[PDB]
Amino acid sequence: ATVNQLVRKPRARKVAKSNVPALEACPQKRGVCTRVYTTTPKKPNSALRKVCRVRLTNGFEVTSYIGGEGHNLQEHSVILIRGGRVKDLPGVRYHTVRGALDCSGVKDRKQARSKYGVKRP
Amino acid sequence: ARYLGPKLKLSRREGTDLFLKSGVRAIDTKCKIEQAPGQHGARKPRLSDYGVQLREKQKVRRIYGVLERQFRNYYKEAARLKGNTGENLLALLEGRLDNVVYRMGFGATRAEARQLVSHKAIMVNGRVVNIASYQVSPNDVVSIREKAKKQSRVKAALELAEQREKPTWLEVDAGKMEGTFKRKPERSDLSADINEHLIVELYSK
Amino acid sequence: MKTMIYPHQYNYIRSVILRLKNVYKTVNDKETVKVIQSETYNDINEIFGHIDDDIEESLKVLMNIRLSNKEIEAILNKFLEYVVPFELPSPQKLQKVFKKVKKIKIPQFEEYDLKVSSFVGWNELASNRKYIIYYDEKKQLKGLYGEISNQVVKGFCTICNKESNVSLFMKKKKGDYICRDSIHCNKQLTDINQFYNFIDKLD
RNA sequence: UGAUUCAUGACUGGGGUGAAGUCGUAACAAGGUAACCGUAGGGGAACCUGCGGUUGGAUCA
RNA sequence: AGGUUAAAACUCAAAUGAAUUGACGGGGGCCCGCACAAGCGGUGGAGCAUGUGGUUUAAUUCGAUGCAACGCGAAGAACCUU
RNA sequence: CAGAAGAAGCACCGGCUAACUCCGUGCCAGCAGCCGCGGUAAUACGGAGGGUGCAAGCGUUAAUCGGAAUUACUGGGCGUAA
RNA sequence: AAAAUGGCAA
Ligand SMILES: [K+]
Ligand SMILES: [K+]
Ligand SMILES: [K+]
Ligand SMILES: [K+]
Ligand SMILES: [K+]
Ligand SMILES: [K+]
Ligand SMILES: [K+]
Ligand SMILES: [K+]
Ligand SMILES: [Mg+2]
Ligand SMILES: [Mg+2]
Ligand SMILES: [Mg+2]
Ligand SMILES: [Mg+2]
Ligand SMILES: [Mg+2]
Ligand SMILES: [Mg+2]
Ligand SMILES: [Mg+2]
Ligand SMILES: [Mg+2]
Ligand SMILES: [Mg+2]
Ligand SMILES: [Mg+2]
Ligand SMILES: [Mg+2]
Ligand SMILES: [Mg+2]
Ligand SMILES: [Mg+2]
Ligand SMILES: [Mg+2]
Ligand SMILES: [Mg+2]
Ligand SMILES: [Mg+2]
Ligand SMILES: [Zn+2]
C-alpha cells in the first residue's frame, strides 16, 4: 500500500475475541450446576467425559469439564470455574476448579495435587 | 533461599568439580564424579543447544551458590554496566563478600564462608557485615572478628587456601586474618572453563 | 405373597412415576395433573396383579401432589423387592451356550445388576465381541455373540429405543446399533418385546 | 407520535455438527456427455439443457 | 430477474500454490502371454469317490477361505493314530 | 545466654522443553497449550523410585505487549497461493 | 451400446 493510501485509510488491527467470554475477564467465576452428566468425546477419542452445565453469577450458562478421577458434583452444587477448553469436547470452554466451594478434591492423588485440590498427606 | 541438598550430585550433573567440598580429599574418592546422579545417570543423553546453555548457567550458579532470582538480577546489572556483559557478570559474582571470604582462605568452602559471614564473624572496613551478597569495592579490607579469630575452622581453611592457587587481586595476611580486595578480578584471572557467553545468550533467549 | 414383576416392567413403573413427578413439578393445571395421576395409578395396577397395602401406600405417596425424589427412591426400592432377578447360568452351561468359543471367560455380574437385568450382556474387548445371554419366551436360555464396533457414537439403540452411546453390532449384512453398555441398556429397557424384536431382526 | 436498541414469539429459511441411514453418482482420468464462468429455462437430488465466454481440457498414432 | 455495498454467531487446524516419486485412467505409443483368434478334449446335468460350507450331534477335534482355501496340513481316522 | 536446636515446599520429566524407569490400567479410567496419548510390555493416564526446574514459594486461570515482517511508517503482498 | 457402488482405521 502507498503512503497516500495509508494516510487516507490507516492499517487496521484485528478484533482478537476472547475464547472464554463467560468469565468476562475474571480469573474465575462461581456457578450453580444445573446438570451433571457424561458426554462422549469427538473422534478419534473414546471416553465418558464428566461435564456439568453451570449457571454463572453473571447469568451466562456454560458447560464446564470436571477433571480428575471421580467427583461429588450434583445438580445445585456451587462450583468455581476457570478458563480452559477441552479439545475433544465441543462447546466446553471451561474447567471446574477442584477443591473449591462445593467441588471436592480428587481422592488418593499424590502428584499434581495442587491441580486437583488435594491437601498434602 | 539456599540449597541444602547433597553437594556432589551438583558436581556430577555438571560433570566438573564445583569445589563444593573442602578439597582435603579428591572428589573421585568421595563420589563417582564422571557419572551423572540417579538411576539413568550412567547413560549420557545428547544435549540440545538450550541444554548446553542451561547447564553452563546452572554450573556458575552452583559454584557461587546463587538462586535464580538473584542470578537474574546480576545478569541485568551486568548488561546495564558498561563493557562486556559476560565479564561484568563474573566480576559481580567475584565481588560477593561470600566469595571473597572463601578466596581469602577464611572459609574452606563458599558455604562455610557463607556461614561465617551470616554469623557475623566477618568485618568489612572495620564494620560487621552479615550479608553474603554484599559487594566488596576495590581497596576494601575484609577481616575476621577478634572473637572469631580463635575458631579452628578458620585456621584449617587458611591451610587449604595455601594448597590452592592464590588470587592475584586479593592480598591476604594470615595470623592477622585480614585481607584486602586490591582490584576487581580480570577475566584472565578467572577460570577459562566457564563460558559466560552461553549465559548471556541464554538470558537473551 | 408380594406380586412378582419382571425387570422391564419395573423400569416402566419407574418411567411413569418420573412422568407423574415431572407433571407435578412442571404442570400448573390441576386438571392435567389429575389425569396423569389417575393414569399412573392405573398403570401400576396393570403392572401388579395384586395390590398389597405396601403397593397401596406407595401409590398413595405417588397420588399426593407433593411427591418427592426421596419418596420416589423408597417407592422404587419397595418395587425392587417385587422384581425377580435374572437367573445366571452355570459356567458349564454358559460354555455349552457358546461351545465354539474355547475356554470362554464369564465376567462376574453383580446381583443388583442381575436383579434389574432383562438380558445379560458383556463385551470382550480383546476380541471386540459383545456376548448377550437371555431367556426366550419359551424360557430356554439363549446366548448370542457378535462383533461390536470399537467406535462409540450417539444414536438410538435398537434394543431400548433410547438415544444413547451406541456401537454397531454385527452378529457372528447391515449391523444394528445398540448400547455399548448393556447394564445401562437394561435400565433403559421398559419392554421385553423390544429386545425380542431385536433378536428377531438379527435372525 | 416516531426512531433506535435489547429480549421474546406459533411457525419458517438457509447454515453447521453427529452412525457404517435412504436415493442416486455430479466432480477429480477424455471421470466415461472435457470442466468451469455469466445468464436463462427445467428437474427428487447431486444436476440437465440453451446462448455466449475461458483453458484452469485429454487424444493425434 | 437481480446488481451493488457488506457482516456476525458458530466451526475447523487446517485450507491453499507449485513441483516430486508412485499408483491409477472407459489417456497415447510400442511389445508380450493358450489373452484373443484357429482348434481338440472337458467341467456345469447322472451315479459314485473325495474335500468344503451348512445343518445335526454327547462329540461330529484343530487348521487352510478370491485368484494364491475346498483329493489343502492328512505320503493313507476300525482300535492305535486322536 | 542455650542449643542443631525452632524453620521446605510446588510444578514438571513424549516432542516443542531441562529431566526415565518399574508397576497398575487396557480407546476404559483418564491426560491435553499444540501435535497428540490410552484398544495388554504406556518415558504421554494413575502410583512409585529416580531426575529436572524453581524455592517461601510453586503452579493454574484471567489480562496486556512480545514472538507476529500475521495491517508490514520503520517492515509485506496481488500471473497460478487471499 | 451399456459400464453404478465400496464406513474409518493405521
Ligand atoms: K484415541
Ligand atoms: K423481533
Ligand atoms: K457433467
Ligand atoms: K449453463
Ligand atoms: K474464523
Ligand atoms: K459334464
Ligand atoms: K465334477
Ligand atoms: K510498507
Ligand atoms: Mg526471596
Ligand atoms: Mg460422473
Ligand atoms: Mg463429465
Ligand atoms: Mg474435466
Ligand atoms: Mg435438460
Ligand atoms: Mg442488499
Ligand atoms: Mg457333476
Ligand atoms: Mg488363521
Ligand atoms: Mg479313534
Ligand atoms: Mg529433553
Ligand atoms: Mg503396562
Ligand atoms: Mg497470556
Ligand atoms: Mg507487529
Ligand atoms: Mg504475505
Ligand atoms: Mg483457484
Ligand atoms: Mg487467486
Ligand atoms: Zn439400549
mmCIF file of all heavy atoms in Angstrom, chain B residues 4 119, chain F residues 3-9 56:
data_model
loop_
_atom_site.group_PDB
_atom_site.id
_atom_site.type_symbol
_atom_site.label_atom_id
_atom_site.label_comp_id
_atom_site.label_asym_id
_atom_site.label_seq_id
_atom_site.Cartn_x
_atom_site.Cartn_y
_atom_site.Cartn_z
ATOM 1 N N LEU B 4 20.246 -26.891 50.295
ATOM 2 C CA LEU B 4 20.688 -27.636 51.464
ATOM 3 C C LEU B 4 20.830 -29.123 51.139
ATOM 4 O O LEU B 4 21.025 -29.931 52.043
ATOM 5 C CB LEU B 4 19.690 -27.417 52.601
ATOM 6 C CG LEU B 4 19.471 -25.966 53.039
ATOM 7 C CD1 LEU B 4 18.406 -25.890 54.119
ATOM 8 C CD2 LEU B 4 20.762 -25.322 53.520
ATOM 9 N N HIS B 119 27.018 -15.401 60.294
ATOM 10 C CA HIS B 119 27.099 -15.487 61.746
ATOM 11 C C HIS B 119 27.919 -14.331 62.321
ATOM 12 O O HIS B 119 28.357 -14.399 63.468
ATOM 13 C CB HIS B 119 27.621 -16.869 62.159
ATOM 14 C CG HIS B 119 26.630 -17.966 61.954
ATOM 15 N ND1 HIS B 119 26.714 -19.187 62.587
ATOM 16 C CD2 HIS B 119 25.531 -18.024 61.192
ATOM 17 C CE1 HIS B 119 25.694 -19.947 62.216
ATOM 18 N NE2 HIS B 119 24.959 -19.259 61.371
ATOM 19 P P G F 3 24.615 -25.703 75.507
ATOM 20 O OP1 G F 3 25.084 -26.844 76.346
ATOM 21 O OP2 G F 3 25.636 -24.760 74.965
ATOM 22 O "O5'" G F 3 23.809 -26.322 74.271
ATOM 23 C "C5'" G F 3 22.659 -27.170 74.527
ATOM 24 C "C4'" G F 3 21.729 -27.124 73.341
ATOM 25 O "O4'" G F 3 21.186 -25.785 73.205
ATOM 26 C "C3'" G F 3 22.358 -27.431 71.977
ATOM 27 O "O3'" G F 3 22.371 -28.837 71.760
ATOM 28 C "C2'" G F 3 21.417 -26.680 71.031
ATOM 29 O "O2'" G F 3 20.257 -27.427 70.737
ATOM 30 C "C1'" G F 3 21.080 -25.431 71.843
ATOM 31 N N9 G F 3 21.969 -24.301 71.587
ATOM 32 C C8 G F 3 23.232 -24.123 72.093
ATOM 33 N N7 G F 3 23.802 -23.013 71.694
ATOM 34 C C5 G F 3 22.856 -22.422 70.868
ATOM 35 C C6 G F 3 22.915 -21.204 70.145
ATOM 36 O O6 G F 3 23.845 -20.386 70.096
ATOM 37 N N1 G F 3 21.738 -20.977 69.431
ATOM 38 C C2 G F 3 20.650 -21.817 69.411
ATOM 39 N N2 G F 3 19.606 -21.433 68.662
ATOM 40 N N3 G F 3 20.590 -22.964 70.089
ATOM 41 C C4 G F 3 21.723 -23.204 70.792
ATOM 42 P P A F 4 23.157 -29.501 70.524
ATOM 43 O OP1 A F 4 23.381 -30.953 70.785
ATOM 44 O OP2 A F 4 24.328 -28.667 70.126
ATOM 45 O "O5'" A F 4 22.039 -29.381 69.386
ATOM 46 C "C5'" A F 4 22.192 -30.148 68.164
ATOM 47 C "C4'" A F 4 21.119 -29.735 67.189
ATOM 48 O "O4'" A F 4 21.274 -28.322 66.893
ATOM 49 C "C3'" A F 4 21.126 -30.455 65.831
ATOM 50 O "O3'" A F 4 19.813 -30.772 65.394
ATOM 51 C "C2'" A F 4 21.762 -29.418 64.901
ATOM 52 O "O2'" A F 4 21.385 -29.562 63.548
ATOM 53 C "C1'" A F 4 21.205 -28.134 65.501
ATOM 54 N N9 A F 4 21.974 -26.954 65.128
ATOM 55 C C8 A F 4 23.192 -26.573 65.628
ATOM 56 N N7 A F 4 23.660 -25.481 65.077
ATOM 57 C C5 A F 4 22.696 -25.126 64.145
ATOM 58 C C6 A F 4 22.607 -24.056 63.235
ATOM 59 N N6 A F 4 23.533 -23.110 63.113
ATOM 60 N N1 A F 4 21.507 -23.993 62.446
ATOM 61 C C2 A F 4 20.575 -24.947 62.574
ATOM 62 N N3 A F 4 20.554 -25.997 63.390
ATOM 63 C C4 A F 4 21.653 -26.031 64.163
ATOM 64 P P A F 5 18.961 -31.944 66.086
ATOM 65 O OP1 A F 5 19.874 -32.925 66.741
ATOM 66 O OP2 A F 5 17.939 -32.458 65.128
ATOM 67 O "O5'" A F 5 18.199 -31.123 67.226
ATOM 68 C "C5'" A F 5 17.228 -30.118 66.839
ATOM 69 C "C4'" A F 5 17.290 -28.968 67.812
ATOM 70 O "O4'" A F 5 18.373 -28.083 67.445
ATOM 71 C "C3'" A F 5 16.072 -28.038 67.858
ATOM 72 O "O3'" A F 5 15.113 -28.469 68.814
ATOM 73 C "C2'" A F 5 16.665 -26.678 68.256
ATOM 74 O "O2'" A F 5 16.318 -26.305 69.572
ATOM 75 C "C1'" A F 5 18.178 -26.885 68.154
ATOM 76 N N9 A F 5 18.894 -25.803 67.486
ATOM 77 C C8 A F 5 20.126 -25.317 67.846
ATOM 78 N N7 A F 5 20.543 -24.330 67.095
ATOM 79 C C5 A F 5 19.520 -24.143 66.179
ATOM 80 C C6 A F 5 19.360 -23.235 65.113
ATOM 81 N N6 A F 5 20.264 -22.319 64.779
ATOM 82 N N1 A F 5 18.218 -23.315 64.389
ATOM 83 C C2 A F 5 17.313 -24.242 64.727
ATOM 84 N N3 A F 5 17.355 -25.143 65.704
ATOM 85 C C4 A F 5 18.495 -25.044 66.407
ATOM 86 P P G F 6 13.564 -28.637 68.426
ATOM 87 O OP1 G F 6 12.772 -28.907 69.660
ATOM 88 O OP2 G F 6 13.447 -29.595 67.288
ATOM 89 O "O5'" G F 6 13.160 -27.187 67.882
ATOM 90 C "C5'" G F 6 11.753 -26.894 67.664
ATOM 91 C "C4'" G F 6 11.607 -25.824 66.610
ATOM 92 O "O4'" G F 6 12.117 -24.570 67.122
ATOM 93 C "C3'" G F 6 12.380 -26.035 65.304
ATOM 94 O "O3'" G F 6 11.638 -26.853 64.407
ATOM 95 C "C2'" G F 6 12.529 -24.602 64.780
ATOM 96 O "O2'" G F 6 11.450 -24.229 63.948
ATOM 97 C "C1'" G F 6 12.541 -23.754 66.053
ATOM 98 N N9 G F 6 13.849 -23.202 66.385
ATOM 99 C C8 G F 6 14.721 -23.652 67.346
ATOM 100 N N7 G F 6 15.822 -22.944 67.420
ATOM 101 C C5 G F 6 15.663 -21.964 66.451
ATOM 102 C C6 G F 6 16.532 -20.911 66.069
ATOM 103 O O6 G F 6 17.647 -20.630 66.532
ATOM 104 N N1 G F 6 15.984 -20.145 65.037
ATOM 105 C C2 G F 6 14.761 -20.365 64.450
ATOM 106 N N2 G F 6 14.398 -19.522 63.472
ATOM 107 N N3 G F 6 13.941 -21.355 64.806
ATOM 108 C C4 G F 6 14.454 -22.112 65.807
ATOM 109 P P A F 7 12.328 -27.575 63.147
ATOM 110 O OP1 A F 7 11.528 -28.781 62.786
ATOM 111 O OP2 A F 7 13.795 -27.740 63.361
ATOM 112 O "O5'" A F 7 12.137 -26.481 61.994
ATOM 113 C "C5'" A F 7 10.834 -26.308 61.381
ATOM 114 C "C4'" A F 7 10.913 -25.202 60.358
ATOM 115 O "O4'" A F 7 11.392 -23.998 61.005
ATOM 116 C "C3'" A F 7 11.877 -25.436 59.189
ATOM 117 O "O3'" A F 7 11.222 -26.099 58.113
ATOM 118 C "C2'" A F 7 12.290 -24.011 58.807
ATOM 119 O "O2'" A F 7 11.422 -23.437 57.856
ATOM 120 C "C1'" A F 7 12.219 -23.258 60.137
ATOM 121 N N9 A F 7 13.517 -23.079 60.776
ATOM 122 C C8 A F 7 14.156 -23.967 61.603
ATOM 123 N N7 A F 7 15.322 -23.544 62.022
ATOM 124 C C5 A F 7 15.463 -22.293 61.439
ATOM 125 C C6 A F 7 16.490 -21.332 61.499
ATOM 126 N N6 A F 7 17.607 -21.486 62.203
ATOM 127 N N1 A F 7 16.318 -20.188 60.795
ATOM 128 C C2 A F 7 15.191 -20.038 60.087
ATOM 129 N N3 A F 7 14.161 -20.871 59.958
ATOM 130 C C4 A F 7 14.356 -21.996 60.666
ATOM 131 P P A F 8 11.858 -27.396 57.406
ATOM 132 O OP1 A F 8 11.361 -28.624 58.088
ATOM 133 O OP2 A F 8 13.332 -27.211 57.271
ATOM 134 O "O5'" A F 8 11.244 -27.350 55.925
ATOM 135 C "C5'" A F 8 9.889 -27.828 55.698
ATOM 136 C "C4'" A F 8 9.624 -27.965 54.217
ATOM 137 O "O4'" A F 8 9.791 -26.671 53.581
ATOM 138 C "C3'" A F 8 10.545 -28.916 53.438
ATOM 139 O "O3'" A F 8 9.892 -29.514 52.321
ATOM 140 C "C2'" A F 8 11.612 -27.949 52.917
ATOM 141 O "O2'" A F 8 12.333 -28.455 51.815
ATOM 142 C "C1'" A F 8 10.709 -26.788 52.520
ATOM 143 N N9 A F 8 11.374 -25.504 52.349
ATOM 144 C C8 A F 8 12.391 -24.987 53.110
ATOM 145 N N7 A F 8 12.773 -23.796 52.721
ATOM 146 C C5 A F 8 11.953 -23.505 51.641
ATOM 147 C C6 A F 8 11.861 -22.384 50.795
ATOM 148 N N6 A F 8 12.630 -21.307 50.913
ATOM 149 N N1 A F 8 10.931 -22.416 49.812
ATOM 150 C C2 A F 8 10.154 -23.500 49.704
ATOM 151 N N3 A F 8 10.149 -24.608 50.438
ATOM 152 C C4 A F 8 11.082 -24.550 51.404
ATOM 153 P P G F 9 8.772 -30.659 52.467
ATOM 154 O OP1 G F 9 8.276 -30.770 53.869
ATOM 155 O OP2 G F 9 9.241 -31.900 51.785
ATOM 156 O "O5'" G F 9 7.612 -30.067 51.537
ATOM 157 C "C5'" G F 9 6.660 -29.132 52.100
ATOM 158 C "C4'" G F 9 6.378 -28.035 51.105
ATOM 159 O "O4'" G F 9 7.588 -27.279 50.849
ATOM 160 C "C3'" G F 9 5.918 -28.472 49.712
ATOM 161 O "O3'" G F 9 4.528 -28.761 49.712
ATOM 162 C "C2'" G F 9 6.253 -27.221 48.898
ATOM 163 O "O2'" G F 9 5.273 -26.215 49.032
ATOM 164 C "C1'" G F 9 7.562 -26.763 49.536
ATOM 165 N N9 G F 9 8.760 -27.211 48.835
ATOM 166 C C8 G F 9 9.584 -28.249 49.187
ATOM 167 N N7 G F 9 10.602 -28.404 48.376
ATOM 168 C C5 G F 9 10.445 -27.400 47.432
ATOM 169 C C6 G F 9 11.242 -27.074 46.307
ATOM 170 O O6 G F 9 12.279 -27.628 45.918
ATOM 171 N N1 G F 9 10.720 -25.983 45.611
ATOM 172 C C2 G F 9 9.580 -25.295 45.953
ATOM 173 N N2 G F 9 9.236 -24.265 45.167
ATOM 174 N N3 G F 9 8.827 -25.602 47.010
ATOM 175 C C4 G F 9 9.317 -26.655 47.705
ATOM 176 P P A F 56 13.193 -17.738 48.011
ATOM 177 O OP1 A F 56 12.804 -16.298 48.012
ATOM 178 O OP2 A F 56 14.597 -18.071 47.639
ATOM 179 O "O5'" A F 56 12.828 -18.412 49.418
ATOM 180 C "C5'" A F 56 11.965 -17.713 50.361
ATOM 181 C "C4'" A F 56 10.516 -17.913 49.988
ATOM 182 O "O4'" A F 56 10.151 -19.292 50.249
ATOM 183 C "C3'" A F 56 9.492 -17.067 50.765
ATOM 184 O "O3'" A F 56 8.393 -16.661 49.956
ATOM 185 C "C2'" A F 56 8.968 -18.054 51.807
ATOM 186 O "O2'" A F 56 7.675 -17.732 52.266
ATOM 187 C "C1'" A F 56 8.939 -19.318 50.964
ATOM 188 N N9 A F 56 8.862 -20.563 51.712
ATOM 189 C C8 A F 56 9.630 -20.934 52.785
ATOM 190 N N7 A F 56 9.340 -22.128 53.239
ATOM 191 C C5 A F 56 8.316 -22.573 52.417
ATOM 192 C C6 A F 56 7.578 -23.771 52.384
ATOM 193 N N6 A F 56 7.761 -24.778 53.234
ATOM 194 N N1 A F 56 6.622 -23.891 51.432
ATOM 195 C C2 A F 56 6.445 -22.878 50.574
ATOM 196 N N3 A F 56 7.080 -21.710 50.508
ATOM 197 C C4 A F 56 8.015 -21.616 51.468
#
